[PDB]
């Protein structure tokens, strides 16, 4: 119990340092990616630490047909994180495509199926301002006795290799490297903002709801205050 | 009342034991129904209040927005007329 509390306190301190680092990274102005630079993004498995948790603005075309729905909960709503294969470069026939994985934000459980929406999704070239992110807490959310079923759209955690295989893009390593979380950079950069998706109380926005700069910094349930509370509780239990 | 009268009023058949035991259980099975009905009645009342507001103050807010836009145009028009006066003074030196 005391050992567990000490470990929780150490993890809280490490998470605080990581959150400060991510805030410093995201405070920088967005890096533009248009034209050929979008078709050959600088992100790679080896250089990812340079661009990790860093705001870029990349142009490309999203594929809403093959969207993955990673289970997630946002403000008491059980919905899905809406990952899509983001196509940057492709040949005229369309057989050969390369791109990335784009987290469009939280989409409620009711509207997750394509036939459940009153829209025909736009799959043309669009510019998205996204934070390049490792995609860590999504990959560590499945828990025990949970596993993804691909070859169908069944997901429990963001397994980067399985998502990359599902995308079918040729540049498998770059797709596996990271995901780009659709973010709104006109929001406060503190992790205490307590508005994690770019919405209002009346939810007047349109699904999926993009993240605020505080939402990207937010690890659900593992922030330093939660770990400090857990450490205090376990210290009290032990003593 | 009259026990004998009430014990054979129902077609000379006796169900008084079950009637007596019915009150105790029936005193509690209606609580969830009652509370959810309170919730539904409040929802209906809120919807009727919204209907009244939309019927009455719905049109009025649109006129207020229309007048806001017209007032923005009026401010721009005043500045434009000041510029026109200045251009009337400076015939071509303004350009």
């Amino acid at each position: 119990t005391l050992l567990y509390g000490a470990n929780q306190s150490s993890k809280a301190r490490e998470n605080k340092v990581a959150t400060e680092t991510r805030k410093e990274r995201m405070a920088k102005p967005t890096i533009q990616l248009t034209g050929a630079d979008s078709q050959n993004p600088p992100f790679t498995e080896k250089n990812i630490n340079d661009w990790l948790y860093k705001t870029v603005s990349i142009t490309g075309r999203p594929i809403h047909g093959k969207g993955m729905m990673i289970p997630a909960k946002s403000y008491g709503l059980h919905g899905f994180e809406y990952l899509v294969p983001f196509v940057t470069k492709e040949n005229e026939d369309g057989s050969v495509q390369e791109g990335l994985i784009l987290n469009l934000g939280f989409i409620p459980r009711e509207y997750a199926p394509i036939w459940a929406r009153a829209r025909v999704e736009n799959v043309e070239e669009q510019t998205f301002t996204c934070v390049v992110t490792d995609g860590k807490h999504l990959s560590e959310q499945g828990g025990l006795f949970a596993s993804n079923k691909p070859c169908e759209n069944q997901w429990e955690y963001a397994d980067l290799d399985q998502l990359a295989k599902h995308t079918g893009f040729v540049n498998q390593e770059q797709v596996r490297s990271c995901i780009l979380e659709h973010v709104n950079t006109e929001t406060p950069n503190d992790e205490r903002d307590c508005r994690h998706i770019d919405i209002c109380s009346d939810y007047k926005e349109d699904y999926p709801y993009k993240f605020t700069r505080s939402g990207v910094l937010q690890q659900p349930g593992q922030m330093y205050w939660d770990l400090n509370k857990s450490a205090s509780y376990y210290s009290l239990l032990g003593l | 009342r009259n026990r004998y009268w009430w014990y054979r009023s129902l077609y000379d058949d006796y169900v008084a034991r079950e009637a007596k035991l019915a009150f105790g259980i029936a005193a509690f099975i209606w609580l969830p129904h009652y509370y959810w009905g309170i919730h539904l009645n409040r929802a209906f009342e809120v919807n009727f209040s919204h209907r009244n507001y939309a019927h009455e103050w719905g049109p009025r807010r649109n006129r207020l927005a229309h007048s806001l836009e017209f007032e923005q145009f009026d401010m721009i028009l005043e500045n434009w007329q000041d510029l026109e006066d200045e251009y009337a003074q400076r015939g071509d030196g303004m350009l």
């Binding site: - | 836009e69 145009f73 028009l77 434009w80 026109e84 251009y87 303004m94």
Partner: protein, 77 residues
């Protein structure tokens, strides 16, 4: 009334149309509609302030409005 939300368009062609209507209205109303033919449509004026916030902010700014007036005068000769 279940009215859905859609933010200001800021579309290039739509805002060009609305700004042309706004300029026509400014030129007509600045002389109390003494033109031979008046083409101003007041209603579209409203929409100019509902779907072109950038151009509306430019028009409110005194220096931007002065530049717009100078260019319009040059265009009208």
């Amino acid at each position: 009334m279940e009215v859905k939300y859609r933010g200001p368009s800021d579309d290039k062609l739509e805002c060009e149309f609305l700004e042309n209507n706004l300029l026509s209205c400014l030129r007509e109303k600045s002389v109390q509609d003494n033109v031979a033919k008046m083409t101003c449509r007041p209603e579209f004026l409203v929409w100019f302030f509902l779907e072109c916030p950038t151009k509306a902010a430019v028009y409110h700014d005194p220096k931007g409005l002065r530049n717009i007036f100078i260019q319009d005068k040059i265009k009208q000769k």
